[PDB]
Design a protein around this ligand. Structure first.
Ligand code: LQV
Ligand code: ZN
Ligand code: ZN
Ligand code: ZN
Length: 459
């Protein structure tokens, strides 16, 4: 059940305006054949150019929406549009490029895919709403064959040079002219009614349509993301480490303990309401407080309505004590909240563009996250950086400069001179906090929150 059988049927109705008279009965086998490629009865780890939904979801970091539009079929110029917002015009002789032959166009295609994908994926998955020209245009920039390895590293090969007769991965592909063993999924096979725009625009107001190839390419990928990650969710699917996943996750746990520990010391709430992950543990297990959990899965579509989370009658009294929302995205936090909220606008290898302003954050699991909205935080303020330790000043077992900081809140600093232990810990905590922030996480707190209140927790 692993790969998509070439003997599987392919619904051709989508193709019959670009390809009038196309048989209603077709396999992948005959489609790949008609696209001008030959699989050659090949057991060599590339059984089909086309892949399952399941496979496409494991390989989401690899998704590039692709669309081709006639300009005036060997006769006429072709507009090539990618979900990177690029358009190339190929001649048979937002970014909008003038008409140029295939021999140069294929070079630019390799450079674009390599720069976009080298820090994301080992492959490309062309995400299609297939009408004909996209499929018949592949012969001009794609070569297939047995799975191979990069000529300069152990990475699987994604590109091919006709100049040197060699193979490269995305990192080593400079000057290569062919996409090598790409993958593709036609979204129109999934069983929709009506065209791309009518389907896309059900879910998403953020991508317009200027009637240009890059726009459909963007809408195709967006609709695909909606289907696979918003409406359907799957937290059993794992995803490989490609960046600072582990450091970020650790950072997140250290900042959550720090911020909540201090909140309790400063304002001594009698009850904390912990709203979100139904797996959550007390992030401050020593704290005096009544710790009450409330279960809420990460909202992949629209942010939760605080009205529906709280009212309908818990501690019932959510206005008692403090509410901890740690990546539990609501429309408007109450005034007595500690909040961690993912900023969907961050640029990183972990954050992929999503649906209707949301982003798809892929760190071990894929989490589609609703658009970041500043108005949710109106009852709060941004939490300032600080470091709080009540740990003893005792070094144990760094090469040092004395730390001076107003935000190192320790006995040693109170006493005039920060000890070496607290300077090592302060600098590790600040590095973790910077990691987490640049990963796109933002921190918000009740307005009464004042780190001045922490100093008298030593006397
Ligand atoms: C990708 C692809 C798929 C099919 C075809 N062509 C056909 O099926 C023939 C030619 C005219 C109608 O029947 N060409 C390209
Ligand atoms: Zn390589
Ligand atoms: Zn969209
Ligand atoms: Zn100290």
């Amino acid at each position: 059940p692993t790969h998509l059988s070439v003997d599987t049927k392919f619904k051709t109705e989508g193709l019959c305006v670009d390809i009038p008279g196309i048989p209603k009965d077709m396999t992948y086998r005959r489609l790949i054949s008609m696209m001008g490629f030959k699989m050659n009865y090949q057991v060599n780890g590339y059984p089909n150019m086309f892949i399952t939904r399941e496979e496409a979801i494991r390989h989401v970091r690899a998704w590039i929406g692709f669309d081709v539009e006639g300009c005036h079929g060997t006769n006429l110029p072709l507009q090539l549009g990618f979900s990177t917002g690029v358009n190339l015009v190929a001649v048979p002789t937002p970014l909008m490029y003038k008409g140029l032959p295939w021999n140069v166009v294929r070079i630019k295609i390799v450079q674009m895919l390599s720069d976009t994908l080298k820090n994301l994926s080992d492959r490309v998955v062309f995400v299609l709403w297939a009408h004909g020209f996209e499929l018949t245009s592949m012969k001009y920039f794609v070569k297939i064959g047995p799975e191979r390895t990069c000529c300069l590293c152990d990475r699987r090969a994604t590109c091919f040079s006709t100049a040197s007769d060699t193979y490269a991965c995305w990192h080593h592909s400079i000057g290569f002219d062919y996409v090598y063993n790409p993958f593709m999924i036609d979204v129109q096979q999934w069983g929709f009614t009506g065209n791309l725009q009518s389907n896309h625009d059900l879910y998403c107001q953020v991508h317009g349509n200027a009637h240009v190839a890059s726009c459909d390419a963007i809408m195709t990928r967006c609709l695909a993301v909606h289907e696979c990650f918003v409406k359907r969710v799957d937290w059993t699917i794992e995803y490989p480490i490609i960046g600072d996943e582990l450091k970020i996750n650790a950072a997140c746990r250290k900042v959550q303990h720090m911020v909540v520990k201090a909140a309790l010391l400063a304002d001594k709430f009698p009850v904390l309401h912990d709203i979100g992950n139904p797996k959550a543990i007390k992030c401050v297990p020593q704290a005096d407080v009544e710790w009450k959990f409330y279960d809420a899965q990460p909202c992949s579509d629209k942010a939760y309505k605080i009205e529906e989370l709280f009212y309908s009658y818990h501690s019932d009294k959510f206005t008692d004590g403090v509410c901890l929302f740690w990546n539990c995205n609501v429309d408007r936090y109450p005034a007595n909240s500690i909040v961690c909220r993912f900023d969907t606008r961050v640029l990183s290898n972990l954050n992929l563009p999503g649906c209707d302003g949301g982003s798809l954050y892929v760190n071990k699991h894929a989490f589609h996250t609703p658009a970041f909205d500043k108005s949710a935080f109106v009852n709060l303020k941004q939490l300032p950086f600080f470091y709080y330790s009540d740990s003893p000043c005792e070094s144990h077992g760094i090469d040092y400069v004395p730390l001076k900081s107003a935000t190192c809140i320790t006995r040693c600093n109170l006493g005039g001179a920060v000890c070496r232990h607290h300077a090592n810990e302060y600098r590790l905590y600040l590095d973790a906090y910077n990691m987490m922030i640049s990963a796109g996480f933002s921190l918000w707190v009740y307005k009464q929150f004042d780190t001045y209140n922490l100093w008298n927790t030593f006397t």
